[PDB]
Symmetry: D2
Subunit: 513 residues, 4 copies
């Protein structure tokens, strides 16, 4: 009788590992995969926000594809008010990050009781007087090259690609179309074209204002939409500038060009997010799993943070319990190597936002136990490149020792998070407690898998040896109070020699006070 799927863990074959997965092997307390929850009408309440942190929300995503600067700021203040509430106890405190999502290049319909019928004609008018008053046969789109670059025999998608069309005319400002799949047209719904790469700006003027607002707001990360090359990301960084240099950029991949130029995009970006709801419209849907598994895998081999994002638990927008396809996907995502798992409408405009976060908390914890670490660690090391970096050797050594003694933690003193980040790329079962005094680092650290960031508001003792131990004691107390580990249990502590970032070379396997 045992825990953490340990019988499977020591299975010599992956097939045997699955045969030994036990629904009667209760999981460890700590959850490694990060939960990102989009905030909006359902969750913007500090009452909901306080309870979302309680239910395991680690990051708050703001979608500028919708809304205004005033709306989001009210939410960002509201999220920050909720987080400071649990700060009376620093040990029980959880830092919560704020992320910004760009509208990006989008084609949107004009301003609902019109249903498009199969066998009907629709003309995509480009007279801009239908922007507020759009008829069924007269449709205005916020794009100028649809008719120009989409010719007869093409197809168009509106409202999450739920209303399909077929093109029978090409020209200037007009498009005669058939409705292949019909339905109730909605106001200002997204237009998607599978057969073209939009010519619209990857970073528009609204995007420049939206990114600028975040630098004024102290956002820890940003989610760049419709990124098709590294050129797109660099434009985003220059807009963030010197005051946002430390703001992490996560590029959202939702297009064929990005999937092709993905390797260039990853080296450029600070992380990747698989935007499935958009990526599925552009490429055939039955090919999307390959893209998620391809990107999560490449991101893991480069130690760059990857997020799984859309329609994970969608039924929960209207339902209190999730479908089995949904439950399987959230776990398969953690099983695939996703650092963070996200919720969109489920949390933003949902009947059950808290219920969704809790499900993502449970299914994730169970999957982390199910991972074949022995194979995974073998491959990440086998595919690791030999370096003379001290921190890199110490980090791989700490994870190997965590596996050997079955540690209840890996404790890292990190000022920029980079030390703890390298331990995470090696994918330990041991929970990583990054002890930091840089608060933004504590929030941005949530992007990586396994890192439970802890903020030491305790002052500098003026003796590095005393100050370092003071911090190590803070981590020991947190893992005990949260029940991650117990006194007398072994832990790994990573530290350096000189004060300052980049001096990490010290590995300590120690029992807990």
């Amino acid at each position: 009788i045992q825990t953490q799927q340990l019988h499977a863990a020591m299975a010599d074959t992956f097939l045997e590992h699955m045969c030994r997965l036990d629904i009667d092997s209760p999981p460890i307390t700590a959850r490694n995969t990060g939960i990102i929850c989009t905030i909006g009408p359902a969750s913007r309440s500090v009452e909901t926000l306080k309870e979302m942190i309680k239910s395991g929300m680690n990051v708050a995503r703001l979608n500028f594809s919708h809304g205004t600067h005033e709306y989001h700021a009210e939410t960002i203040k509201n999220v920050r008010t909720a987080t400071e509430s649990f700060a009376s106890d620093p040990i029980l405190y959880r830092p919560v990050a704020v992320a910004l999502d760009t509208k990006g290049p989008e084609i949107r319909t004009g301003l609902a009781e019109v249903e498009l019928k199969k066998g009907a004609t629709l003309k995509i008018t480009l007279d801009n007087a239908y922007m507020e008053k759009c008829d069924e046969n007269i449709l205005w789109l916020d794009y100028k090259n649809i008719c120009k670059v989409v010719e007869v025999g093409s197809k168009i998608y509106v409202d999450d690609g739920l209303i399909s069309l077929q093109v029978k005319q090409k020209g200037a400002d007009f498009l005669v179309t058939e409705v292949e799949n019909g339905g109730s047209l909605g106001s200002k719904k997204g237009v998607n074209l599978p057969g073209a790469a939009v010519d619209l700006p990857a970073v528009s003027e609204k995007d420049i204002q939206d990114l600028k607002f975040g630098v004024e707001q102290d956002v820890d990360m940003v989610f760049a939409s419709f990124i098709r090359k590294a050129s797109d990301v660099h434009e985003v960084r220059k807009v963030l500038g010197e005051k946002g240099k430390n703001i992490k950029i996560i590029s959202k991949i939702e297009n064929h060009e990005g999937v092709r130029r993905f390797d260039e995009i990853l080296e450029a970006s600070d992380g990747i997010m698989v935007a499935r709801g958009d990526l599925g419209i552009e490429i055939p849907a039955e090919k999307v799993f390959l893209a998620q598994k391809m990107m999560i895998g490449r991101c893991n081999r480069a130690g760059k943070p990857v997020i799984c994002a859309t329609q994970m638990l969608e039924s929960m927008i209207k339902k209190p319990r999730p479908t089995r396809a949904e439950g399987s996907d959230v776990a398969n995502a953690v099983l695939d190597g996703a650092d963070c798992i996200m919720l969109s409408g489920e949390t933003a405009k949902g009947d059950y936002p808290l219920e969704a976060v809790r499900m993502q908390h449970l299914i994730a914890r169970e999957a982390e136990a199910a991972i074949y670490h022995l194979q995974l660690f073998e491959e990440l090391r086998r595919l690791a490149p030999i370096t003379s970096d001290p921190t890199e050797a110490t980090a791989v050594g700490a994870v190997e020792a965590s596996f050997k003694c079955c540690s209840g933690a890996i404790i890292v003193l990190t000022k920029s998070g980079r030390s703890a980040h390298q331990v995470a790329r090696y994918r330990p079962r041991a929970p990583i407690i990054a002890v930091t005094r840089n608060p933004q680092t504590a929030r941005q650290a949530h992007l990586y898998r396994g890192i439970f960031p802890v903020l030491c508001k305790d002052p500098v003792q003026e003796a590095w040896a005393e100050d370092v131990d003071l911090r190590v004691n803070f981590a020991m107390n947190v893992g005990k109070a949260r029940g991650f580990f117990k006194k007398g249990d072994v832990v790994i502590v990573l530290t350096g020699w000189r004060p300052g970032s980049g001096f990490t070379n010290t590995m300590r396997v120690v029992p807990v006070p």
Copy 2:
């Protein structure tokens, strides 16, 4: 750059994943069986006719919404639609018939609130008088099997009631999750070993007269249920294949004997989801697929794969993921209970399953799977077992278009299917039940040669190998210059499949 062959040769699984291309086009053949559930949405032959082109290989019939005389019109429709293509034996596609029992079930009497207290009684009159004041059940042994602190679930698990007080025929329970209360709702008791073990005998005995290929058993908890179900099928139903559905904690606990007794296992996720903590369902599915895979016994993943396709023409991305992951996990067949029983968009759903599955089959890391499968496979003196493992080894060496197998009971083809070959397994038989039952096994492409028995066995055998060669070329599995594997016998009859021949396609 086809069939994810880049990922296929990767030395590590992580590298293999990195090499997954949205632009690596798959092969024409789909190996994972698609089991449709048939009902009010598609009893019609016109719709059933389109499905066979769409990809459906098995038409399931649900007893839970049926009478013993209700489904016969669908059975004729499936058969007549299937028999339409019989003119070309090469293009003909066999279709199996599956009977799913109503099984041990519980149902409410014929509006609800949250955070409340509700009592449940056995005033049998509440059967025609369902009430907000109290709910009623067809289960009389709830008091015997229920425990205080147990949770009672209603409306497919949306509603939860924790037990507080009992009584003589009543239990006082607290509502944690409220909702809309209707009538005859199924009740899943996750803290119970159901007392119900005659009506069920009738259902299985009637199954034999309908010439059904397989039986899916609802609510199996031990081998004794499986050991009993076969007897109900009888000598008349000696070949009817049983898939023992697991939708309870006990079935998961003693799974091996249930599998050993049965000819297949079904992962019944929707009921299993209520019966077990739902976060732990995938742990159960992956355990079942792996063990069923290791025992060479067919497995099916079933509930909620593309649920949104019932009311929408578009599958959710997570729905797309679950279908693909099941095939990657190793599931032989996939199911659409809701999308086809009362569903508004069935024709596309088949193709979506047909398309996701076809994409995932190439994404499978065959190198690790075959080596682990072979190493775990025991040492055998069975001549067929060696001939099978080799044809799979040969197929990997030549990236085969297909493996052509001559079988009478299907056992020869099923053995190659155990070794999970990428190549389609074209299985040639003159027994139609054999071809219908072969859909249970992943990869086998069942073909029925209706050609007359040639007096010369050697000529007769070549005719089936040529018929199958002909079927693949027409279907698009192989072409001139492709390489195929051919499995035959040395003598007529079953149990002599000792011949593998590697034939350059001309």
Copy 3:
């Protein structure tokens, strides 16, 4: 699981496989490694040779470094007369092949440390060689070194120059005339095939030599010269290149593609390269040869003590086993058979060590490694063979029975290194002799008249293979064996795999 190290085979790690090796897990009666025994004064005896074949000899190597054609021809007459001695029953008849080892570009000639050494290129002293009188075949840098008599006696040559260089001996050794002198410093640029070698190779063709052992091969250019000189009358003669220098190790990839097989000629290689690095050069060449599927021979000092000693040293036993473990197709006996006092005992030891080692191979890793490295192929024959080898493991085959005309089909099974004996049935006598070069292939000569019906002729050779396996002790009735065949007679058509019960 108590036999053939079957408990070690089921190991998931090489280390546990080593931990599971048992001195009580006995082997099959089949030996998979070719035994090449150099013929000469102690082996030419017909009675001695007829005992060597029974003991386990498969190939007879003639050294043309020494000897006259007349002597060698009497040895081939004797070897052949001694091979057909077992021909009374074709079922028990073991084909024996004859090899020609070329003299090659060689430089040949009471000493004390620092003693006088004044070299003479005066050919009048070809008859006369003394303590300071000598001659070297070569007629073509300061601070370099020279080695003589197998590099056992060494010289430091500070004084080198226009013609002869006089330098102090770096050691001392017992000496005999006509001895090896080697120069690690320079690429030879010397004829791999001399005029003598051309005369010897032609004698081989007239003598029907199955394999030729090419000497001092440094480049593919050298391998082609031997091939073309053998000619169309000798196109089907196998050419094995012997690597005894650094250029060959450097240019091995180029030589291997040209050569049908390779010999790791260790003795000259140890003088040429630092000797401690010789094992690396062997595990290198044997491994690439297995990856290429071409025959490899480990050749020198494997049981050197047995020239004077009835039993081998522990290191000698380990080297033979380690060669077979490394993946070597053939093991070589040199003086142990040619001028030894125990020719028969050595062959008996080599057969025994080889048998135990083949049982001690970790096939699970080797087969998986061979396939993964091996390319995907259109050839149905290669596809049939990988299937037949996996089939042999699952069914623990008594043997793999393959009908071949040229050996190609049987060679194709051997590259995958199966545990079961390969019984290759051919009506071609040279192919049967040349099939020894490949691991696992037990050549058998069908002496039965070609049947008018092909189906019968196929099943005659298939039945003959069954009869040989039962008599040799390889398999018994009740055993299941793998049989490879083709859809038609002739070369290039092997695509049939039948798992039939032994009759």
Copy 4:
């Protein structure tokens, strides 16, 4: 990247690793495989011994098979003298161990010089002392009185170290009648091997008790026990050594089929194992001796205990100045097999070329340690390892992993009893383990384990342990610089503790050599 067989290391297959081996990839200066050299007339001199230590001797074996207690004491004195001639610089001093190889029990046939055994002849190896001085083809004689008790009908008997074989076809009481199986020339005082046997004779003979007790009185560091067949024999060797010899290490020699099939119990009861091949090849089939060595070296590598390869490795070198090709192969494959220590016997004791041969053991072993496939070996040791709560065991595996990641020039460990270093050695790194001790016995005993380079800090203690830890780590850095092991700007793994005593050993530091 073109050195230390680094290309062949990167292969994802063992066959690729073999295919990628390069004779143009020079090895590291470091040799991790211990060299055990038998000391006899050829090397017993202090001058020869200093030359042996320079050439690579790490351990000196004294054979109680022959020689007087006084003779061996003089060689132990000379060995100690030669070793201490290098105490002039502590950095350049190499610690040298003293090994005692027991004679154990031996059975001999002794008496006109030679005779020949016709196949199937009548031979009586009887216990009558009437034929004690007159051995013949018809009658031979054996010393051990109860051989007749320890052998029974059908028992095989071997003579002259394996040359002649016999079967006890007729039973005899205080008598034995055998039929010759294989023939040859018979001499006198020849040794007898009992292949399938029921031996009851003590592995520790009364003389052996004398030699072991003499050794405890001599400050020997290891004992190579002979003819061990069971753990009782290992336990008896321990009981003789006592609490004064508790620190003395027992290396149980396996030279019988009973040792091979009872190896697991002997290894558990032992500090180490030596594969005594020559004696074993006589008893069991010679062709099966490799199966013995590979199983024992691995089960030993699995156990974290020291294993030794011993007989006829460079035998030709006793007479000739260069080894045979087979002989170089045997030494190499023993390091590739995973052996901690390689040995020289007659080659270093009575042979003409003692220093030629000790140099060849160093050169071949260095080439092989580079030719090891560490990615596979570490992964197997990690998979087969038993999960522990011991932080030192974890730190050792973590340091070995980090050493692989940084391609360090050394793993530095401070240890009093030696275990801390022994554990990094168990995980088999490519990097040299420079082990720092202040205990002279620990430094000497450490040579038994692959990778451990013992350094004896003679430098005095400092008031703070932290400063004393800093000094001992600074000592290793200096030895590595002098030896050529590393250079400033190279990365080295340093292993220490948090407080005193060396049991905890939990602090791994990755530091550049300064």
